[PDB]
Design a protein around this ligand. Structure first.
Ligand SMILES: CCCCCCCCCC(=O)N(CCO)C[C@@H](O)[C@@H](O)[C@@H](O)[C@@H](O)CO
Ligand SMILES: CCCCCCCCCC(=O)N(CCO)C[C@@H](O)[C@@H](O)[C@@H](O)[C@@H](O)CO
Ligand SMILES: CCCCCCCCCC(=O)N(CCO)C[C@@H](O)[C@@H](O)[C@@H](O)[C@@H](O)CO
Ligand SMILES: CC(C)(C)NC[C@H](O)c1ccc(O)c(CO)c1
Ligand code: NA
Lengths: 291, 107, 120
């Protein structure tokens, strides 16, 4: 079991790094892929890449060895880098939802409203918020619990548990996950709602001659919308539920499960290349990039 | 295939013994301790070579159980080179027990 | 299979009128843009007019006020009513459907094209 658990982590890192390198390559190397949407995809892929290179590997060791080998400074920097890259990833998924909703439902308004320079500000904002929730609290010790047993792990350099106070775990969870999850629901719900109301206007048009049914395109669009919300939710909702649970009755949920769910969340970063880069132009670039 | 332990033979049969030993702490009074007895018989055959099932009656030999801090029964202590590697407590089905042994044995 | 069937073009006197029509047969996602582009000889293809499933429109400057785009509420069919034609408007006109059914990206369908020639 601990033989196969370790091998599994390895390919997680392989899938993340490969996938996100392949994406960033494709976008930078293809004139046709440098669209406005793919600008936000580039932000996403950067976040997930840093997850694959630095965040997951150092985390993989802490499971294998059962202790932190690189001393108190790097514990806190790695922790910041983790929170930063997760926050950027998830908040960027949320920006993409918004973007696509506008470009599908108000395409002409969206072209004038959403300039390339406006997109850059949105992107930079997302990383600023991600920094200010991770690096600023974590490096400045605002996250720290006052407990004695918590203060033992802070003084031990072999211990790199992420024990936070009440306030930080609430705020950090809301900012990194819950606000984005609500936005992503609201927004993608108005895509479903818009498409259903549009089919009503088509049946009203017919003067009772036809009633429309879900065709190939409509089932496929609903499957996509499901994958987007399903995979994201599956991957991060368990961890972020449990993270809020620990703020109340910390004994209730085991530590091995808390960590197991944090790995499920890292796995999202391997999924995002697969979900968000299926365009015919991406497919062409990927084959060109693999000689 | 099962070793039937004493207080005295415990050092030679479990602490000195080669490979993995799964010790069952059972009693004749406990209804939960018996419910796994026919399941452990099947495990001794099906995990031949990989594991050795061992049993110790706490009515017979009360001196062993205090040392490892056994609260309830049945408690299954898996042993690896004179140390307790993993533990389980309470009664189980065959499929629940196979997953515990599958996970622990293949490192 | 999706296919776009263009009609209504041809030859016409300057100051006259034409009414292009493009009938999109096949599965198209409810949310989309049907449009008209054109390509005058030895030039690049440009947008003429476009209409979202929603009802919003978008025109080029050259044709603003003269041309008006509309769509059949029932079927996937789009009409470009071209009035006050000038020799400048002469081009091969292409029907286009931007399909949004993939959500993250759009799929494009183009018509074969139909000639419009406006003589003075
Ligand atoms: C620690 C990793 C820090 C990574 C910081 C990445 C910044 C990403 C910037 C970006 O992707 N832009 C769009 C192009 C320009 C704004
Ligand atoms: C460019 C946009 C700049 C906006 C920057 C504001 C970021 C949001 C404010 C903020 O960072 N937090 C909410 C404020 O509570 C989260 C934590 O900073 C805070 O919760 C913790 O410091 C305490 O919980 C621990 O003592
Ligand atoms: C053809 C595929 C149609 C599938 C569409 C539904 C996918 C389910 C997505 C999902 O899991 N949630 C969003 C609601 O569906 C639940 C979360 O929001 C959770 O917090 C409550
Ligand atoms: C515990 C460890 C490995 C540092 N991971 C943190 C986790 O990925 C995370 C990311 C962003 C967050 O806002 C929080 C909650 O503080 C947690
Ligand atoms: Na520490």
């Amino acid at each position: 079991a601990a033989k196969v658990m370790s091998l599994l982590m390895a390919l997680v890192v392989l899938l993340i790094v490969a996938g996100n390198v392949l994406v960033i390559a494709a976008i930078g190397s293809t004139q046709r892929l440098q669209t406005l949407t793919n600008l936000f995809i580039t932000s996403l892929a950067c976040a997930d890449l840093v997850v694959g290179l630095l965040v997951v590997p150092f985390g993989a060791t802490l499971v294998v060895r059962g202790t932190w080998l690189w001393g108190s400074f790097l514990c806190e920097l790695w922790t910041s880098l983790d929170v930063l890259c997760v926050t950027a990833s998830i908040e960027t998924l949320c920006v993409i939802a918004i973007d696509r909703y506008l470009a599908i439902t108000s395409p002409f308004r969206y072209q004038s409203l959403m300039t390339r320079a406006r997109a850059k500000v949105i992107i930079c904002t997302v990383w600023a918020i991600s920094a200010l929730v991770s690096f600023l609290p974590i490096m400045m010790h605002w996250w720290r619990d006052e407990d004695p047993q918590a203060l033992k792990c802070y003084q031990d350099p072999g211990c790199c548990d992420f024990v936070t106070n009440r306030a930080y775990a609430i705020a950090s969870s809301i900012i990194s996950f819950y606000i984005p999850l609500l936005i992503m629901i609201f927004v993608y719900l108005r895509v479903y709602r818009e498409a259903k109301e549009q089919i009503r206007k088509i049946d009203r048009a017919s003067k009772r001659k036809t009633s429309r049914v879900m065709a190939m395109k409509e089932h496929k669009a609903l499957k996509t919308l499901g994958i987007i919300m399903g995979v994201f939710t599956l991957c991060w909702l368990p961890f972020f539920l449990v993270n809020i649970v620990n703020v109340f009755n910390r004994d209730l949920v085991p530590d091995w499960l808390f960590v197991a769910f944090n790995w499920l969340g890292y796995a999202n970063s391997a999924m995002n290349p697969i979900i968000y880069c299926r365009s015919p132009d991406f497919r062409k670039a990927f084959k060109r990039l693999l000689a | 295939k099962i070793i039937h332990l004493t207080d005295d033979s415990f050092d030679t049969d479990v602490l000195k013994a080669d490979g993995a030993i799964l010790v069952d702490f059972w009693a004749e009074w406990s209804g939960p301790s018996k419910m796994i007895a026919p399941i452990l018989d099947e495990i001794a055959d099906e995990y031949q070579g990989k594991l050795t099932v061992a049993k110790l009656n706490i009515d017979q030999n009360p001196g062993t159980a205090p040392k490892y801090g056994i609260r309830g029964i049945p408690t299954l202590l898996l042993f690896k080179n004179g140390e307790v590697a993993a533990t389980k407590v309470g009664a189980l089905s065959k499929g629940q027990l196979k997953e515990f042994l599958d996970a622990n044995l293949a490192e | 299979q999706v296919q776009l069937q263009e009609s209504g073009g041809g030859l016409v006197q300057a100051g006259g009128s034409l009414r292009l029509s493009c009938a999109a047969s096949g599965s198209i996602f409810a949310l989309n843009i049907m449009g008209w582009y054109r390509q005058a000889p030895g030039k690049q293809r440009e947008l003429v007019a476009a209409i979202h499933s929603g009802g919003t429109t978008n025109y080029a400057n050259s044709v603003k006020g003269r041309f008006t785009i509309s769509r059949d509420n029932a079927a996937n069919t789009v009409y470009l009513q071209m009035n006050s034609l000038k020799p400048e408007d002469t081009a091969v006109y292409y029907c286009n459907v931007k399909d949004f059914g993939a959500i993250i990206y759009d799929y494009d369908y183009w018509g074969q094209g139909t000639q419009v020639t406006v003589s003075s």
